[PDB]
Amino acid sequence: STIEEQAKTFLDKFNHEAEDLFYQSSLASWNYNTNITEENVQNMNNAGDKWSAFLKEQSTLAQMYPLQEIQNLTVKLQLQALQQNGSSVLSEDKSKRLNTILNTMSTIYSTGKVCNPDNPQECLLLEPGLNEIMANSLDYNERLWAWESWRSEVGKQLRPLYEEYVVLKNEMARANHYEDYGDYWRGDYEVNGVDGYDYSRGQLIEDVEHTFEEIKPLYEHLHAYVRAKLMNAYPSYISPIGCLPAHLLGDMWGRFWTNLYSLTVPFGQKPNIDVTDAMVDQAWDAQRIFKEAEKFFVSVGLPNMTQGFWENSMLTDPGNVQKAVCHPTAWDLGKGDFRILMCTKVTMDDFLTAHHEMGHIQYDMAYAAQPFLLRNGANEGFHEAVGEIMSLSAATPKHLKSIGLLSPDFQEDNETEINFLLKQALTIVGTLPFTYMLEKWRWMVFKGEIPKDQWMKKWWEMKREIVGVVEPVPHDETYCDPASLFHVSNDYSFIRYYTRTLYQFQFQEALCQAAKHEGPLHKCDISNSTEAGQKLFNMLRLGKSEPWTLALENVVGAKNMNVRPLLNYFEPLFTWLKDQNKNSFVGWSTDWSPYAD
Amino acid sequence: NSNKLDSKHSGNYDYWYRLFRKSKLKPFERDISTEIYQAGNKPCKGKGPNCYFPLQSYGFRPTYGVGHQPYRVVVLSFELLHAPATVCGPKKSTNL
Ligand SMILES: *[C@@H]1O[C@H](CO)[C@@H](O)[C@H](O)[C@H]1NC(C)=O
Ligand SMILES: *[C@@H]1O[C@H](CO)[C@@H](O)[C@H](O)[C@H]1NC(C)=O
Ligand SMILES: *[C@@H]1O[C@H](CO)[C@@H](O)[C@H](O)[C@H]1NC(C)=O
Ligand SMILES: *[C@@H]1O[C@H](CO)[C@@H](O)[C@H](O)[C@H]1NC(C)=O
Ligand SMILES: [Cl-]
Questions:
Q1: In the record's cofactor note, how is the cofactor described as bound (chain A)?
Q2: Degrees, nearest 5: CA angle A219-A220-A224
Q3: How many domains does chain A have?
């Protein structure tokens, strides 16, 4: 009689059909990604076409249920997730034009090539070539040339295409009752119909601005320290007060400052923690690595692992006969089939990466009983954060000593922890202003607040005012340098990283408080505690059928993002760094530029 | 637990179960029903929008959780009613 029950029957049918269809699609992806042939490409194309056709058919068939007549939350969430037609609301002509422009974005970004001005036939791609150029070479001229060649080759091609991309996305968002594409992206954190847990679309902007305001001083102190080190290295290129050049930040866009570590190492003479010698000495292999991480996960009381993962997943590079793309990814094929793929090497980095991947598998397996439409994290930012917190836990020297990789005679001191915290800051503190400003700038572009003819100008003004980065050579409006990034040119949100950074440290603080640890936050270990495992499971089982605020409160007790764990973890780092910055200027001037003399 | 004989890759689509019936069943009853359900008002014919086929499938694969694992169940029933017993336990004794 009622429409709710018909919706229940429809979702019951959809779940059982989509389980099998998604399993076949993901199995095709799994047999292609590890094992690269030409027929596997066809098999995946067929499976993906069937999956997309099924999704479109289900959306069209279930659009006839209005959401105003649903009561219990479980169903309303399923139907809201199903009903989002996305690009199908737009007319077919503009939709296909949009898919072609997306394909050209992918092709230009992936096949983008730059040639040295001395050899026309010698050209380099980005990841194979320019990545290494700006990650290893200390030459100023070479880094400048890599930056300028890459940007002048991609942005001029990508500018008008990005313009029409923004126009079409804004039109589609306005079709779907959204003011702009920024609002469509922000709708991920949206929830309604739950008292005491509501969240608005501008609330995200407000809280992210407030969090950046409270996190600003540590970033400015780290900027002062990095600038001092850079003028020590490069006296004739960097002003004592002006902003740092873009191509001196360790990577292609200034995303991460992990490379600059050697420049800002406090005690180059103090030994660094590395146990690759321990693995080669003990003849450690991939299987023992994953068994060690298995027992690490068992230590907190998490559910112990299944057979099929060990039997069928490839834990090693499949030789040279078969070539594999082994970026670290955890695959949930559905119906209880969990799999891993990465070319495992005997390195500590691979140890932490394996711990991260197992964390993703643990999350994926935790909500296996949840229906098909909801088997995902409370929001987008809970998967990676849960994967990274385990790697953070495993990186503690206490765990290494416990598991017999680090000698007990190793003497922990203040300098070693200062070095480790500077490493963590260079990987984490550097990227927060970049993520915030990049996502925010795109939001204004989507809002259309910034006219076409000053996008680049306003972008660089924001960068010099808030990030302390100034371009070395001036650019006009014909460039599309933001599109020179993987996430910008290929339709991905970027704020995910800021929220992940907040969430992982909130979780770390909560679990460490539950673990009864008497020592520095960075020395905290979460093993030995089945209470911590139970606390983690209390949210692991939830999925996203409930608001993300409730899931976050189930771990930390807070209903909103807070910055206290991040400042508490870096407090000794903050006080040491402010001790250093007494003899250096704090802040940056937006007027100074390398090309202005 | 039967995880070696009653399990297969590519999904096992042979075992059934029923989720829809007009009322409650009576003890020790067999009902191979083929009729289509009815919600409360429609003179529906066939698989109507409110009239569904009341049979589902036990999708089985050997990579399932223990709680969802396809357990093999057999029940043994006895009757303690006054009548000539034909089946009884064995017993054996000593030497002469
Ligand atoms: C190689 O490709 C075949 C094709 O289906 C696949 O079955 C096999 O698992 C692949 N080898 C791997 C993934 O190591
Ligand atoms: C929603 O369903 C749950 C589980 O059956 C039930 O406990 C609860 O009362 C229902 N709530 C509403 C609003 O119908
Ligand atoms: C299996 O996991 C439980 C917690 O879920 C734990 O008590 C047990 O020790 C684990 N098994 C082994 C062999 O450690
Ligand atoms: C380590 O194990 C035992 C558990 O009773 C105890 O000595 C101590 O509380 C544990 N450590 C932590 C951090 O819980
Ligand atoms: Cl910006």
A1: Binds 1 zinc ion per subunit. Binds 1 Cl(-) ion per subunit.
A2: 115
A3: 1
